[PDB]
Amino acid sequence: DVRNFKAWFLPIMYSIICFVGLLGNGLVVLTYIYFKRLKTMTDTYLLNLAVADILFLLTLPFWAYSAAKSWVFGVHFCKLIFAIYKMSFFSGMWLLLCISIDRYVAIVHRHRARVLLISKLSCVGIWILATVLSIPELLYSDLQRSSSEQAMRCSLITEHVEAFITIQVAQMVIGFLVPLLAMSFCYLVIISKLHALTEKTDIFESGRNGNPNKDGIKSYRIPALLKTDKGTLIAGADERRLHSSDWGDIGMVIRRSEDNGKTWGDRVTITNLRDNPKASDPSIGSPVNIDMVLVQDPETKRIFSIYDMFPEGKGIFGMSSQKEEAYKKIDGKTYQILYREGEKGAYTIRENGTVYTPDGKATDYRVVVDPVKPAYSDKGDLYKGDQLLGNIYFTTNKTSPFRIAKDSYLWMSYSDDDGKTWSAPQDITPMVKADWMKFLGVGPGTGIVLRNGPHKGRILIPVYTTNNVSHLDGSQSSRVIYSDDHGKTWHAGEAVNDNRQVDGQKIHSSTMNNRRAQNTESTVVQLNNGDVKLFMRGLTGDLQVATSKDGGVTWEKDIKRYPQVKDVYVQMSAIHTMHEGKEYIILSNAGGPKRENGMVHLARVEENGELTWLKHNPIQKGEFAYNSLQELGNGEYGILYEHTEKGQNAYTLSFRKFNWEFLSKSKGHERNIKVIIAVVVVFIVFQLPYNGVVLAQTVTCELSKQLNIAYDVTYSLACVRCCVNPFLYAFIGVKFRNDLFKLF
Ligand SMILES: Cc1ccc([C@H](NC2=NS(=O)(=O)N=C2Nc2ccc(C)c(C(=O)N(C)C)c2O)C(C)(C)C)o1
Ligand code: NA
């Protein structure tokens, strides 16, 4: 079963897959020449790869003559075009590999004066490598009698040669396997990095369809993200066990990541007050901790978590209607108050937890002020002598006589070991909560430490208050609390709303009643010029920013409003950052019109301290609410945010990392081009079948014909690859098709 139309079939095949190839690869040269000034490192590599494609294409004529007649060109040129092919395949493998290390370091150019040195020095080194390893091809190819009529044909030499294995296998492991392996390393981590910058990682996974999750936890809310001096990422959240609402059995928890957010450890629990086992409605039968602010003091390295606390009830909706005094100053000391069932007077908790009567006599009762159980679940337990009776934070079905005021409190815990272990909670309420304040709680997220100015080192925590005139209907007002002594002592700054003009009249946080003049949870930033900016959740539809020239203590009277950034009435987070010598602010919040379509806004800080918004880019489609930003270093940033997919309970807290290229460039310019991928897969899928069939050619007569038609088509695909390569540059390519058509 033979034929000789296969003798004329190849003259036309080598003709067209040589014109397409020499036309396409010629366009690649000419376009590179008059464009030389703006040439990359890969642009010089893709050139030499077209040179290799041309040199191999310039032999296909001589195969057309030989198939149409015979080889009239000698043993010299026969030995030479097989070696010239190995030059193409080996250089292409090493040119492709030089793209790899280029893109590897470029995603893991700054001085053009040595981007040419090492670039073209490896063009010369590859050709020397390609030419040296291909010179052994001169001895395994020559002219053949063949006993096939009067026909002289050029071909590799047949089976009887085996001293070749010590030579040829070496060629393929250096000219191919080393490229293939090293290319496989580069483009594997390159893919890992692009994965890291484009996919979210679930940090606190909520349950699904209303059920609890692997750990019996229905819901997570309220993220905080902190980057420590040691490079650690701390992610904090509310662990909302029973439901998603702002009350119930909530624990303050964190997860540490020691590799910049790739993997995260197990949950650490700062605080989890024990529930009331005798409460009638469990969904509201536990003392509550809710909303934390993280910040690390950069001198001492102590990490602070500051958060709200309410006694047993519906959180802020469990406060008493008429005020209950919570603290009482006696002989210069401030003690917390206890109310005893049946009576009116104020018991006090003095030294060691000892409960004193309204007239100052010690009782046999005692409060666990220094808890010792895991998560400090035992804080507030009430003992008579050494018998446990109850807990001062319980307000219903009590098993002891004493409860604390049903008011609003502010607690703080610290870590001196990178967040692995946390102190017992310390009550900072009496240092910051004035008498008129109905509520005082944090704006969750990440506070700051002033970097510059006459107040540097001061720690700022955002908070907001209500008064007893209008409470949550018209007095929510932002401010900061601060500490100038490394967290020991706290002070309340003034409110943005104190002495502010609204409708031609002054207002004050303590007396106001005015829904549209409120401002609630906020995020704080210090500029390099020393001013403090406060970005405040409010109800004008757009971003409100207040300014303080004295380190947070007082605020200017004018609230700047930026319609460029919409505020759908939800928390946001903002951070200061530098880039290439210029100052910027990144702000993240829901882009709307509901709590959805998470966005990252970019602003440049002008000389006056005002913001020029440059860019607004979606960071997360779908449900998007509270979030927390941090700078990670080396032009990268992370964001921990509330989100729900596919019937997740509100909310799951996820982590995304991004860089300045995502942050500044337009929506289309991603990067994951990667025409390089297409060239590599074809340079393998086509050439590898050939050079493998010619290696198994070595190791009745018509079983080798199966090995011979293997030799034909796999040599045919290795020829068509030198045409497919310019088509790769134009279609999926970005620069080429643009640049070529624009020089016509
Ligand atoms: C000067 C000039 C005009 C036209 C051309 C063609 N270069 C490309 N054509 S293409 O397919 O559009 N892509 C090309 N290069 C290319 C690929 C991939 C990357 C990552 C870069 C890179 O290293 N950059 C830092 C961004 C790059 O530059 C040549 C060389 C094939 C002729 O070069
Ligand atoms: Na090419």
Residue numbers in the entry: 52 to 159, 165 to 251, 1001 to 1472, 255 to 259, 262 to 288, 297 to 341
Question: What does the study report here?
Answer:
The CC chemokine receptor 7 (CCR7) balances immunity and tolerance by homeostatic trafficking of immune cells. Important homeostatic CC motif chemokine ligands are CCL19 and CCL21, which bind the CC chemokine receptor 7 (CCR7) to guide B cells, T cells, and antigen-presenting dendritic cells to lymph nodes throughout the body (Förster et al., 1999, Förster et al., 2008). The human CCR7 shares the seven transmembrane (TM1–TM7) helical fold of GPCRs where helices are connected by three intracellular (ICL) and three extracellular (ECL) loops. A short aliphatic helix (H8) anchors CCR7 in the cytoplasmic side of the membrane.
